[PDB]
Amino acid sequence: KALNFGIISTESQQNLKPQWTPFLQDMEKKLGVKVNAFFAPDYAGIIQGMRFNKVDIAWYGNLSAMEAVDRANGQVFAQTVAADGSPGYWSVLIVNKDSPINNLNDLLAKRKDLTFGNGDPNSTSGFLVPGYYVFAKNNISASDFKRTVNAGAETNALAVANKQVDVATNNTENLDKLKTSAPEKLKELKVIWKSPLIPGDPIVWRKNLSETTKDKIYDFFMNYGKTPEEKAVLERLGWAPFRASSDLQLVPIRQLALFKEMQSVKDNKGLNEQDKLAKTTAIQAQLDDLDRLNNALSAMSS
Amino acid sequence: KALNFGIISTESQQNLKPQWTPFLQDMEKKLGVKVNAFFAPDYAGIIQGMRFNKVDIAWYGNLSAMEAVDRANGQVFAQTVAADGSPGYWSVLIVNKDSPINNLNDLLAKRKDLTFGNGDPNSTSGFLVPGYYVFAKNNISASDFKRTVNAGAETNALAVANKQVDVATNNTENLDKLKTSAPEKLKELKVIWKSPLIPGDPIVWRKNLSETTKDKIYDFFMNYGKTPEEKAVLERLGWAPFRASSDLQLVPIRQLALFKEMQSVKDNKGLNEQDKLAKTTAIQAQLDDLDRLNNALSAMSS
Helix, strand or coil: CCCCECCCCCCCCCCCCCHHHHHHHHHHHHHCCCCCEEEECCCCHHHHHHHHCCCCCCEECCCHHHHHHHHCCCCEEEEECCCCCCCCEEEEEECCCCCCCHHHHHHHHHHHCCCCCCCCCCCCHHHHCCCCCEEEEHHCCHHHHEEECCCCCCHHHHHHHHHCCCCCEHHHHHHHHHHCHHHHHHCEEEEEEEEEEEEEEEEEEEECCHHHHHHHHHHHHHHHHCCHHHHHHHHHHCEEEEEECCCHHHHHHHHHHHEEEEEEHCCCCCHHHHHHHHEEEEEEEEHHHHHHHHHHHHCCCC | CCCCEEECCCCCCCCCCCCCHHHHHHHHHHCCCCEEEECCCHHHHHHHHCCCCCCEEEEECHHHHHHHHHHCCEEEEEEEEEEECEEEEEEEEEEEEECCCHHHHHHCCCCCEEHHHHHHCHHHHHHHHHHHHHHHHCCCHHHHCEEEECHHHHHHHHHHHHHCEEEEEEEEHHHHHHHCCCHHHHHHHHEEEEEEECCCCCEEEECCCCCCHHHHHHHHHHCCCCCHHHHHHHCCCCCEEEEEECCHHHHHHHHHHHHHHHHHHHCCCCHHHHHHHHHHHHHHHHHHHHHHHHHHHHHCCC
16 A cells, blocks of 8 residues: 655756655655655646546645546645745735725725726736635726736835835735835735635545545644654745645635636637526626635634 | 525414514515515425425524435525524533643543543433544543433533532533523633534525525625614524524534434444445545544634
8 A cells, every 4th residue: 555645846856856755754654654756747647647546645736736626536635834834825905004994895985086006917816816806706897996007016015005006916925025025114004805815735635545544644644743853844845734624725716717717708709698698607606606605614703 | 586484483373473574574675575484394394395496595403404405405505693692502521620631632531530421312412412523533432431420511510510520511502501500610610622613503595596596695694683673683583693604514413413323333233244344434434524624624723
């Protein structure tokens, strides 16, 4: 009963090897079952490895992560945690502290009268994530602000801080940097809207594993880190210890997937509107259900 | 597009009528769609009403609630909240405050050396709920205490308080009463283990409703109560305003269902062990998956 982990490698074939064997070697111990890897070229070959039992487990990104559930027996069981201390990031919208805005509701209104900072239109956290939760969800637009401007978080946070822009989007990881980059202009910022947590990469195994096997993996992963040795070894892969997870993980990413896809049907050229109505109104279905989940989940305050 | 609510009535045909029309009459307004009820004799006829679109929505109990999802297009969308202030209850285990125990781990060990207070063996919160989360889950027993005694929460809490028993089970709703019944012997108690939240009755509609319809119900329910009028009307049905919910609701009840069922196969007389192994080890599968969910859910601390 040997074991395969999945790790692609942008950190190529030099970089990766000596960061990992350790984590295998403890894995092999506690599990006491030989623990090879699949290095990779991309998640595409990796999911496929799952799809054929040739790989048992793996460090996906929610996107890859989600298609694993989709096509190759995925079950998220754990969320990676940043060695600085977790855990993913929340998208945001930010006014200056001297602003008399505090709600997204405030903002939502005083909008035709204000100037916006929007992220890379190829950025999920600066552009797309807010694009759904903020805009799409309220049937309103980046249009509808006096003037609107696209730029980087760092800029945009600084933009707002220095009252060159009314409101901007951002993430909380940039918000972090600042406490070092410009602590005294982050002190001037004010967050008025948080996305869902957009969380860290998961660990997915294949469901078709065995009661007993999973039990060991699961506990390995849930308990690795409590030791100074253990602790310091996660770090070499930039990690803190792992959060307990589920497929519920990727609800934010699922919504995105299907907001995009929704967006691409409204533009589907050679589709008649009868047959649109159907699909559009079906993807919404899904979002609407997914919305209510987010609520439920956030309503376990608590 | 008229509307049917489900409400059984132990509070029979006199009691119920004038507690509800109000809540219909607001329902009919905001929805602006006529809102009859099904009174009932039992959830059995009620789920069936769903199963035939003859009823659209209803106040189930997690048990009924769960079989609704099972057999008649259930989706939990809201959790009832006690007019005193919510929300279900957590089972517990309780030592005296002068005890040097604080963990379930402590207890788990010092057990052969101690005396237990166990609830009605026909009580879910005093007996069965702990029976799983505490015992079943750690493959250990009510056996394994010096002596063990079964009795009511009130007794048992008082038992422990007055150091007639080492540890006992309880719920937090009794724990409430006490602050009135015996505030100064509840002051002597100490909780060392909480179950999952075992939550309040839900509102389930049938999935096969319509985007738009659900949207209105959903918002009606999520927003009813903010007004003094609204507020005071929920009260006449002993309610505070409603929590946002999902089928995730009944994970605790699902685990129970299948702990029982697990328990009843181990006792299934005319079943050979080969064919047992299979089922036992399949129900465990489920619990084990459900366990990991509880974790995930409780690991969104947060």
